[PDB]
Design a binder for this molecule. Structure first.
Ligand SMILES: [Cl-]
Ligand SMILES: [Cl-]
Ligand SMILES: [K+]
Ligand SMILES: [K+]
Ligand SMILES: [K+]
Ligand SMILES: [K+]
Ligand SMILES: [K+]
Lengths: 291, 291, 291, 291
């Protein structure tokens, strides 16, 4: 049993091609992902090499930086750094027609330099994360007189997410009248799918009624169709004053028949009502007798 | 009677944990909240203690700043300030291999320095506020032949909010067939929940009909379930050319049975039609006779 | 007959209060509206006064700018300009403990200076406009066998608006069973309210059927209720790769009973199919005979 | 047979007018479209011709730049470049009342200069692209016992698009009871129009049932009405942490009656499950016998 969706809801499918690419994915399309400290290294790195190059560029021009040593790389490099940052001390003024032309070019570079560098930082850099915890398991047990598929999520930060949508989706292999076998998605209807203010915990619920794609199914039948469940969550995070997304996926064998999530809200001596996420993945079962 | 939601719709529940944190909540996740004047202080402060440091850094290098006094902090500090701002007067040029290397590092810093500082300012700094006033009370009284749960809201600014949604929500403790007591959310249907152009005042209305979760309830029964009402409002503000959110919460004892909001629109000698928010929280009751 | 909504769908109602204000409406809440050329003046202006002040600040410190004339404002001012821009020529270096402290403060100022100035520009400055033309009139005439309320809109730019929503809304004075007279909004159902790709012209249509709030109404009855129609349009503009909004309002006497918009699409010798907005406000009527 | 919508869903219709323009379309309304390398040229170019100008401006003032040659353009130009970038070496200080006034003006320019330049870059520059491939053809064939209009789309990048909407739309010429011929849009209902996580491939499907605008139509009848199909796709791209849009259009003769898309998912020796976009446009037909 290989898994079509990973737990984080990434696709396992291998992709085939080697030709074109996202314009701007990389001309984030193709930096704004890797960790903060790394990001800085890269910009730092790029900052140096760029300078050390213009440095190399002045030298190959001659002894054309005043008050500089003959053909010295450090002196020049620092003049470069001193040109690009736009520090312009003066002691190291340019010389002639050429050096000066590299100057105005080098200034331009550090200017855009700064802009791009600003864009990234803001882009990140923004992309905020949702701090949403999904339960490691699902359960099917009775609620309001129906067997109900359930799972739950928690908000890991103190800030509030408002206008929160969850979508719970069955994915499985089906056969058509026409004898074609395909992979189909079903949007399980939830007792409730919109929570206007998500702040603590949320048990999402699919009553398996006669209208449910999983009516009359069992573990065995679910495994036969290699059924999986995909959960997508979204919301506007008060913290970032921005939007957030989280996904997660579950396979059949992560569905506990009969289970009940343990209550996650507590009452305490200090602070009264509380919420203990230590219990978030806890599920109760009734264990049957042996002989 | 302790309150589960505060008037501002913040949650009263105590949260339990002490382990992880929002990546970027603080690496706004963890500044862009505190007041303008404060923000400036902080950046000002940071600006100083970063300079003073590099200052300390040059000194611990030796008498390595030219035209500077021996081991003087002020002179150096100013050279720092003069390096980071990228002012580069020149009179205070760096000395040797080391100082110069701190320089290029210090320039980088003030560069990102500027970018971050720009990001924050724009981030704020944006997050605009909705200037929405909620009535201090709710009422239940007859409209179009049904008892109706009502409350109202007003736009506190001259700008217009377009595409405005309100969601009015009953939260209460219920018992399931299976003898489990939980807290449930109901979306009260509104005679109208979308207002395409919100500009003045808006009375939001829940006709308590047979389909209403509060059909046949009374003050007594509402208190019994510790019922609360949560209101979320959102919209695109023409002002900021951006989105806005406001919430508020009400308990049972802020529902006035029989009350009628007072009309808030006026006709006047000058300007004709007007709107008086002075009367926004005013509610009419019929008082019954004593003996 | 005074008008409750203006043609541009602004509210005519006078607003009453004089106490609080939008935090950031103005601390755009309270610049990013006035025209480009004006914007520049203001920043230019602000740029000068700020400098001329720090100038005044150095002087009141003494003859503390080197190579400057005694107590001269121009010299100082230029040193200020030379400090704030972070030009730092050098010929005009600061003097002592105090001047230098104004320096680091002045640099900070021009830094934020630049950031704010950047934020605004981007904010504007963004807020893009929709170039949407609304017809000066509405018409009620027969379409598909029903009298139909209609009006139309055109896209004034070459770019495309995608995902376009229009909302057409009756506003009028009504009376409740309970003898209260209020102003009510009705969302007229449109044959079609979503146009996924708005690019040329769009006649929006409300079939007055038995379900319509304006079933059996007439000019006379519409005027009695001081009925108005409010139109809100929104969409994502391909141009700005951003969102856009437009509104407009119509009173009774801008509804032409019997009228038909003139066809606005043409066929031509050159370019074949065309679209002539010169005809956009043209309406056909049948004029009855005299004696 | 001329085509009303092109394959990319641009409109073929000629537009008529020559009077007003988008405020900011160009005052992106009217730069942020042309290719990266080009963009840089333009800013580079602009950077130069703004400097050369101020250069010309100083000269026409006299020999007013110190340490500069008499009336030399290069020297001045570089002083310009050295003023605008805010490099401020010093060796080339300004002279008198006038030069200095051009200075503070030139600094302002390079300041806004930088801000605008930063805005554009971020604006671009953002507008991210969707990397969505549409099948070159449509098909009508039986699925679940109904003839079904189908086509499919694929994600060309490794990143995921979440909350993806597709809208498939019949456009054709119709005649009203009132003998008026117009162009009408129909929203074909899809067996599924929202895909919460689009990542690989998606066959979009319109079961032609009794409720379908294309019930009982044929190639002949479709051509008669000059029917076209328009597809709009949108989604939030995880990559850019932003939104994306793609459209495409199809005419009658790009609908293959009886065809079946070839399965695009594969199983392999290495990596097991894969997806081959090489087969994306492949369609199966049953070819009938000759004599
Ligand atoms: Cl499907
Ligand atoms: Cl209403
Ligand atoms: K400088
Ligand atoms: K200098
Ligand atoms: K500088
Ligand atoms: K300088
Ligand atoms: K000097």
């Amino acid at each position: 049993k290989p898994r079509i969706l990973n737990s984080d809801g990434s696709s396992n499918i291998t992709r085939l091609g080697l030709e074109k690419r996202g314009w701007l994915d990389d001309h984030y399309h193709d930096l704004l992902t890797v960790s903060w400290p790394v990001f800085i290294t890269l910009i730092t790195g790029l900052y140096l090499v760029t300078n050390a190059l213009f440095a190399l560029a002045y030298l190959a021009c001659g002894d054309v930086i005043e008050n500089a040593r003959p053909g010295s790389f450090t002196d020049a490099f620092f003049f470069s750094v001193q040109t690009m940052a736009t520090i312009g001390y003066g002691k190291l003024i340019p010389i002639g027609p050429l050096a000066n032309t590299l100057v105005t070019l080098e200034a331009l570079c550090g200017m855009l330099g700064l802009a791009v560098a600003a864009s990234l930082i803001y882009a990140r850099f923004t992309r905020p994360t949702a701090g949403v915890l999904f339960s490691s398991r699902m359960v099917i047990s009775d609620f309001e007189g129906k067997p109900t598929l359930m799972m739950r999520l928690a908000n890991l930060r103190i800030e509030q997410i408002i206008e929160a949508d969850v979508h719970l989706v069955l994915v499985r292999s089906e056969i058509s009248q026409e004898g074609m076998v395909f992979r189909r998605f079903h949007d399980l209807t939830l007792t409730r799918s919109r929570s206007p203010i998500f702040s603590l915990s949320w048990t999402v619920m699919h009553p398996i009624d006669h209208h449910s794609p999983i009516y009359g199914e069992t573990d065995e039948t679910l495994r036969n169709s290699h059924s999986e469940f995909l959960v997508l969550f979204t919301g506007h995070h008060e913290a970032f004053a921005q939007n957030v997304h989280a996904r997660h996926a579950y396979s059949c064998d992560e569905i506990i028949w009969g289970g009940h999530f343990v209550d996650v809200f507590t009452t305490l001596p200090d602070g009264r009502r509380a919420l203990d996420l230590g219990k978030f993945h806890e599920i109760a079962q009734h264990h049957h007798h042996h002989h």
